[PDB]
Design a protein around this nucleic acid. Structure first.
Lengths: 86, 49
DNA sequence: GCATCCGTGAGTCGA
DNA sequence: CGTGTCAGTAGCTGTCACGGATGC
């Protein structure tokens, strides 16, 4: 029903309230730019929404998966396009 | 013990009277929510930092 | 109705 | 491309006069 579709939004908002700020701090240390940390956070939680396998098990820490995804994103930003211009 | 230590001055009495929250596990979470906002405040998560 | 706090300004010219 | 046990800024206040919108 429609409540089944609203439950997914409630679940995303819950994982937001529990992981967004900590992931922002982590990305902020790895990059040093807060405006970049916000982008990393948005993209990481977007990939979290696209993977129901990470949001299914609550007895397993999804925070570590979030940190790993953010780390890979940040190291991908650190290549050629930044290399020349930054 | 706070009244025991800072009793010789009336400004500290007024400080402890005008205080908002009381409790060892309460002011700790207050400091947590004013220091690292946007995070779930656990007694031990603040006891750690 | 007023204390708080925010935002504004703070010389000119040099190799 | 896939990602999955702790995993969490640097820096910093050593400016100030002044006016008026903002706020308990």
């Amino acid at each position: 029903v429609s409540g089944a579709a609203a439950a997914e939004a409630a679940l995303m908002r819950a994982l937001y309230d529990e992981h967004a700020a900590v992931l922002w701090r982590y990305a902020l240390r790895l990059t040093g730019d807060a405006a970049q940390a916000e982008d990393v956070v948005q993209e990481t939680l977007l990939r979290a929404w696209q993977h129901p396998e990470v949001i299914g098990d609550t007895a397993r820490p999804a925070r570590a998966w979030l940190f790993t995804v953010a780390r890979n994103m940040i190291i991908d930003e650190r290549r050629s396009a930044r290399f020349r211009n930054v | 013990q706070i009244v025991e230590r800072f009793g010789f001055s009336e400004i500290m009495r007024s400080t402890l009277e005008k205080d908002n929250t009381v409790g060892t596990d309460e002011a700790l979470l207050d400091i947590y929510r004013k220091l690292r906002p946007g995070e779930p405040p656990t007694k031990e998560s603040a006891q750690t930092l």
